[PDB]
Design a protein around this nucleic acid. Structure first.
Ligand SMILES: [Mg+2]
Lengths: 165, 378, 367, 251
RNA sequence: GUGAACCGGAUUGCCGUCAGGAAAUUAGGUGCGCUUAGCAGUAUUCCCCACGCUGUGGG
């Protein structure tokens, strides 16, 4: 969807200082710190003026935080429930597989305001398992409608199908 | 003039009993039987149970019966209990010695205290069909079909679907009668209706038809069946065997598929009013005219507009949900709404209870904001 | 008439009830998953509390012969007690729920008699069925079923069923459930060969704010305890005092869930009305308030709407509300849902007892 | 003339009706499994209860042994997918693990009353027929089955009633062909009542109706449509409105 | 007014006692924001009313 693509492009157009300023504001709202609010406004509000389906303020702020923390490269076809599933095979079926599976299935009981630390540790295990590519646009489009059953229904389905291979 | 009428049967659960239930095990049939529709039509006209056997049942039993299967049901069972915590009526009476006085002469001496009661629990399991659709098309006299249709337009008594707890969920009087030569063309004339857009559709639609006697003679075919559902009396019941054949009809060549003609999901209204629409700019300009281009809190000139509530978005915008404020007030009330979750009703600058919070937020904004970050947009 | 209690409590992360696998109990209310504490756990904790200790005159057990032999100093009445138990119809042995002193004294005086087995078994069955003067029997009820498969055909059983007079629903969270898993390893005090990795266990826990619901029928409580009246009110006050001040005894040695509630609404009906549907929508924590205030605000909204809804003038209702030091008001904006805002538990007990009848708490502490 | 009552109510975790194996009763609808409370449960739930006992009444309404009863009750059906669960309980000795099970669902009910048969069974009485109709309304709005209520104290109260005076009996069960998915910006009851709204907005485009909601909590229709004739705020006022539409009748 | 009409699967139940994830890691190596600019010695000051052929009064 258009408007997302320019939002991710403007996120990739950022430089060192902007990524650091969104990095220091991890684990917080926006209204407390004014430079973060101003930077997010200057990066987001023209898109909301032009396009009606631009991302919500909370989801855009959260995705900005995660991109500033992890700085994954944007590439189509590297979405989260595929890399999860391609990773899960290399573990011991008795012990480590339920441990990773529980942290992955904990997301279906949390809200967008509460979905910063589990995402932080999931991209952490990606960065530990030597990955450089991730579909940010797909993650933003599924987070914007995260409160619908078919979205998490196709979440773990992409997972099962990547894991079974 | 139409010669055959059409009835539509659909419900959440339905049952149509067979001959294989002479005890507390009630089994059901796959299709609505002739006796069930005859009973429903007798209820719709309003004929007495003692009157159906007197020149009223064979008159409609002369008609031809035709059923089409739109979608068949899942065989379901419900456990039933009778007489929990009560005493039931039992059938034994004392022997009245001489056999000359029996029957109606004995019933004149019956008393309420002469009966005896037994407390027990009578258990039964009854079969119901879930998610089934049927069409009943009866071919008779045009006057008789007109009378039948007028009767079912407004039924005298309440009507049910085989058992008194099975309610109608589509109108039985939905289909207007027509003139057709054969039952097959009539059953193929009424189209096939979909509920929502993506669902399984049966490629074959079975039909049940009465076996035509043809010419004089013409013994029954080997593929015909027998069915004991031709009612002669209803109190006490008397039933008569009949001949039944089976035919099939492939969809896509003699029955069409109708569209959805409605909406299934409900969903909430539209938030997210568009800020590039022309009506929005016109209403914003008029509201800037009304307030004389002055802020509502601090009275500096007005540049932006805040939305008091989001009841209507985009298409309709009455200029009473909009107030004129400047940049600092817009940013302050914007930061007051980052994690509030109030959705519909937003902050009113006219209401005095927010003024002290807003002024402190504005003091924070003047204390902390960097202008050079707002310009040179990185 | 009925007495109804509503209750809003917040708990620390703990495990106050677990299934066979070892995780907290959960439920599905309103399309989302919530934490759960079973009702029977609450009734057991109230029954075995220290504010209910005057009021246990009965036992629910299958070791009746241990109780009969304990009603003896030296006489061997072990084999004959079990024997008469087996001819009685309690054959695993069936759980029997009756009063203490009645079975103790009567089994001591009947089992030690030199009479027939059939007659003494009949007398034991009679005294078991007739020993229905116990407080837990009146509160929680009783059902016993003689197994006729192995029962002597001579004697006959009598009526034994007890209708209870307390209805408590399961504790249900006011919001979404957020399960968590904790990993532990044991250590060795003395160094040595040691493990390769260290076997990791798993302990499941969660934290939630619970809405509990209580209902008390006074007429059935009176009818079960025969012609006594003061014992009914004393039982009501003792149950309120215990339930306000008792927790489930789960994994309390390492998860100390000793919190106390922040709001109690008490009420009086003729018909039971449960107010659990205030939380069909999950409560989302916003930056301003906390979970507790929003929970009781939504409860107040539902209470206000029901009070202004299904309401008959021929039988009007009233009620009092309690909070610690009166910090959390039910009528947060303008409505006076309760008429007698009370800031202490003792005065609430006194008001409830006075509304029941002319009873004082010090007066009925003798039955 | 037929008086038809539409009924939406939510219910707490419990088990009101069970089969021989004990399971919560369940029907099939809309491609999935539906939670179910029997109509022969609501009968002998409302019936022989104390609140309803307020020519002989309770015989013309519901029959016993050619009585031709004039009240028809249908099977309650959930508006979402049935989600059963099993609870694990143990027994003490105070000196083995079993299993119990339960289900939670929001049910739609449907009530129909034949006025002509009720008047005919009253030997020409008319105030008594309307009196019995009102009595059944107050009973049905405040009656639950007496199931496992001591352990699961399920005593919930309704959240919306719409009453109809249509020419022929017709239910709105086909409005719940699509199972209700809960979204963040709503709940189960609001979406159920909205699905009821976008099936009475139709039909007429493709009669009248009185509506009530307690203190007007969840208003029918999510616009200013006239899909219901009047929206009222009391149960007694709704009953008086039903009696008023029947004729000049005071409660 | 229909193998139909009348029709509760109901009563009993604590999952309660046992556990350190622990030992050890520099994110260091290089960069000019640079070339420019009177708030005044003028030749029409956006609109309106009144009086004469520029002087008052209001936006
Ligand atoms: Mg301002």
């Amino acid at each position: 969807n258009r408007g997302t693509v320019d939002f991710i492009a403007s996120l990739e157009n950022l430089k060192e200082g902007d990524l650091g300023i969104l990095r220091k504001l991890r684990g917080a709202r926006l209204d407390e710190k004014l430079p973060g609010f101003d930077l997010f406004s200057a990066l987001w509000w023209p898109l909301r003026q032009k396009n009606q389906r631009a991302p919500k303020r909370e989801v855009a702020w959260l995705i900005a935080k995660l991109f500033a923390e992890f700085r994954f490269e944007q590439r189509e076809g590297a979405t989260l429930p595929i890399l999860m599933g391609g990773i899960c095979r290399k573990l011991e079926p008795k012990k480590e597989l339920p441990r990773v599976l529980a942290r992955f299935d904990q997301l279906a009981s949390l809200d967008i305001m509460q979905m910063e630390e589990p995402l932080s540790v999931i991209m952490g295990i990606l960065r530990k398992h030597q990955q450089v590519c991730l579909d940010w646009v797909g993650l933003t489009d599924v987070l914007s409608f995260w409160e619908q059953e078919p979205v998490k229904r196709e979440w773990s389905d992409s997972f099962i199908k990547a894991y079974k291979i | 003039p139409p010669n055959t009428l059409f009835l539509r049967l659909e419900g959440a659960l339905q049952s149509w009993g067979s001959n294989e239930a002479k005890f507390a095990l009630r089994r059901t049939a796959d299709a609505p039987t002739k006796s069930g529709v005859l009973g429903l039509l007798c209820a719709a006209m309003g004929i007495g149970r003692a009157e159906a056997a007197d020149s009223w049942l064979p008159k409609l039993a002369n008609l031809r019966m035709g059923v089409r299967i739109d979608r068949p049901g899942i065989r379901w069972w419900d456990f039933h209990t009778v007489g929990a915590g009560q005493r039931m009526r039992m059938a034994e009476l004392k022997a009245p010695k001489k056999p000359s006085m029996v029957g109606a002469a004995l019933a004149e001496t019956l008393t309420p205290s002469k009966v005896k009661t037994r407390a027990e629990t009578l258990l039964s399991r009854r079969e119901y069909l879930a998610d089934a659709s049927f069409l009943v098309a009866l071919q008779g006299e045009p006057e008789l079909v007109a009378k039948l249709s007028a009767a079912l337009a407004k039924p005298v008594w309440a009507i049910y679907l085989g058992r008194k707890s099975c309610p109608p969920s589509r109108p039985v009087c939905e289909h207007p009668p027509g003139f057709y030569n054969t039952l097959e063309e009539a059953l193929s004339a009424v189209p096939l209706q979909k509920r929502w857009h993506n669902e399984p559709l049966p490629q074959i639609l079975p039909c049940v038809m009465d076996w035509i006697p043809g010419y004089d003679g013409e013994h029954a075919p080997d593929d015909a069946e027998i069915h004991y559902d031709l009612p002669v009396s209803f109190q006490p019941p008397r039933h008569l065997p009949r001949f039944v054949i089976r035919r099939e009809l492939v969809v896509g060549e003699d029955v069409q598929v109708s569209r959805e003609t409605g909406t299934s999901v409900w969903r909430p209204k539209g938030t997210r009013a568009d800020y590039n629409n022309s009506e929005y700019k016109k209403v914003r300009a008029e509201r800037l005219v009304m307030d004389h281009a002055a802020c509502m809190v601090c009275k500096a000139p007005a540049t932006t507009v805040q939305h008091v509530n989001y009841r209507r978005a985009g298409g309709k915008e009455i200029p009473e949900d909009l107030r004129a404020l400047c940049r600092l007030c817009h940013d302050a009330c914007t930061m007051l709404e980052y994690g509030s979750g109030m959705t519909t009703n937003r902050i009113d600058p006219c209401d005095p209870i927010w003024r002290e919070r807003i002024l402190a937020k504005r003091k924070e904004i003047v204390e902390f904001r960097s202008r050079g970050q707002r310009f040179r947009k990185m | 008439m009925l007495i109804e209690i509503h209750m809003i409590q917040n708990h620390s992360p703990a495990n106050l009830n677990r299934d066979d696998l070892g995780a907290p109990k959960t439920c599905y209310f309103g399309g989302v998953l919530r934490s759960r504490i079973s009702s029977q756990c609450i009734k057991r904790s109230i029954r075995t509390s220290n504010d209910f200790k005057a009021l246990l005159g009965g036992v629910r057990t299958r070791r009746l012969a241990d109780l009969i032999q304990q009603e003896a100093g030296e006489t061997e009445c072990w084999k004959k007690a079990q024997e008469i138990l087996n001819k009685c119809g309690f054959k695993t042995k069936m759980l029997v729920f009756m009063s203490k002193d009645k079975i103790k004294d009567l089994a001591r005086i009947v089992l030690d008699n030199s009479l027939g087995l059939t007659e003494a078994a009949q007398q034991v069955a009679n005294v078991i069925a007739q020993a229905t003067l116990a407080p837990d029997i009146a509160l929680c009820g009783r059902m016993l079923e003689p197994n006729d498969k192995d029962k002597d055909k001579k004697v006959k059983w009598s009526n034994t069923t007890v209708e209870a007079a307390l209805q408590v629903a399961h504790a249900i969270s006011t919001h979404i459930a957020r399960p968590e898993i904790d990993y532990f390893v044991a250590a060795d005090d003395v160094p040595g060969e040691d493990a390769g990795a260290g076997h990791i266990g798993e302990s499941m826990f969660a934290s939630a704010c619970f809405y509990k619901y209580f209902s008390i029928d006074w007429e059935q409580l009176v009818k079960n305890l025969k012609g006594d009246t003061n014992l009914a009110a004393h039982t009501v006050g003792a149950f309120l005092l215990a339930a306000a001040k008792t927790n489930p005894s789960g994994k309390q040695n390492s998860f100390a869930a000793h919190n106390y509630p922040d709001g109690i609404l008490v009420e009086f009906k003729n018909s039971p009305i449960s107010y659990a549907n205030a939380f069909v929508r999950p409560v989302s924590v916003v930056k301003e308030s906390d979970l507790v205030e929003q929970s009781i605000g939504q409860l107040s909204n539902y209470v206000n709407d029901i009070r202004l809804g299904y309401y008959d003038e021929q039988s009007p209702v009233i009620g009092f509300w309690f909070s610690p030091n009166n910090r959390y008001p039910l009528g947060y904006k303008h409505s006076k849902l309760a008429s007698r805002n009370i800031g202490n538990l003792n005065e609430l007990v006194g008001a409830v007892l006075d509304y029941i009848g002319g009873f004082k708490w010090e007066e009925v502490q003798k039955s």
